[PDB]
């Protein structure tokens, strides 16, 4: 069906333990769905929630990439200065080829909105033919980051296939 | 009893040999005192001088992080193109979690003053609960960097903390 | 002879298999010459063509740096999202000290021209006394990249020398 399969992974001890709801996952889904056309026809086919533990985060990025063959994986949360925030360190263990331009743009554009954006420690890269991008836990943030990436994201997914 | 303990590491073969006064060290200290309130009550409680040798740099960063439990270490010097400049490589070996946002802002703002800022090779990150940031050797640089980071550095330290 | 020896490595399956010409090499050469004065008298004394293979790329970056003692290697291509593009992964295995500010500037400046600049995965750094800078595969790009760095590239090369 979908030209590009997208999966969104929410990282949060609080959500994962049933102690709270996921306010970022829906919005993330909603932004991808709303931009399907500019993304060359992409659709979120899976979401999941892990806690702030690297091995849990690694296993999913691995599975989604190697086995389910997702084309785009966004992570939400676990990428700030909190002691538990380990999303980037797990992300960095699984990508094969880094994509610093995407990080640069996310940081450049979100700084225009607030200096607290410098607290984002996001990683991004390519494993196999999957693009993986770390994004922040705030709901407003995915929208801000996806607006920033949108001009090039379709061309990026196109190039990873060839 | 300061809320956040800051420590300042001067890196310079020259200074460490006694061949000259430390110019960067004290000024740096003076900047932090000056910004104490904006930093949520941070104060320098220790300095040290080392030469341009990775092992010595690693040892003090390690000991200040692991044993003295400093909240903020700023290195000054050893982060340019000169053959002996190895501060960032030392730093990279001791941090656990990178914080590229701090490098981006320092780099974005310093470029507005001069294109020679592109020669800063600063690294930065977190080891345990210690934030570590490489800053240049010029005395005026510390202050320009501190001004650039100041809007978010209070919120950074409070997040590391708990 | 030349105050600074520059070498240009062109990375491309197509070019290396004699299935197409090098349109980037020549511009790169041309830009360096046209910029000899501002680079404190530099000159391209070698070029080569390798395919998209990490070992073939490392071998030359290693040889030019360690044996020929070049002072400035530029690479052209293999630094985007295509499956075969491994120039940056090659480059990172050989440099000893990274130079994130050259990357920050090349990205910042080229983003002003187009958002597809975010797809550049360039790396850059120093091995021995050799500056290594990745650049994109378009001919226009080397010129845009070199305009961004030229203000400081002289001081950089002078600082590596001693």
Swiss-Prot record, chains A, B, C:
- The molecule here is called Molybdopterin biosynthesis protein CNX1
What job does the chain carry out? Catalyzes two steps in the biosynthesis of the molybdenum cofactor. In the first step, molybdopterin is adenylated. Subsequently, molybdate is inserted into adenylated molybdopterin and AMP is released.
Q: What does altering residue 12 to D do? A: Reduced molybdopterin binding. Loss of adenylation activity
Q: Outcome of residue 84 to E?
A: No effect on molybdopterin binding. Clear reduction in adenylation activity
Annotated spans, MPT adenylyltransferase: 3-157
Which family does the record assign? Answer: In the N-terminal section; belongs to the MoaB/Mog family.
Q: Which residues form a coiled coil?
A: none
Q: How does it assemble?
A: The G domain: homotrimer or homohexamer. The E domain: homodimer.
- The encoding gene: CNX1
Q: Where does substrate bind?
A: 79-80, 110, 137, 144
Q: Which domain of life is it from?
A: Eukaryota
Q: Which residues bind AMP?
A: 22-23, 78, 137
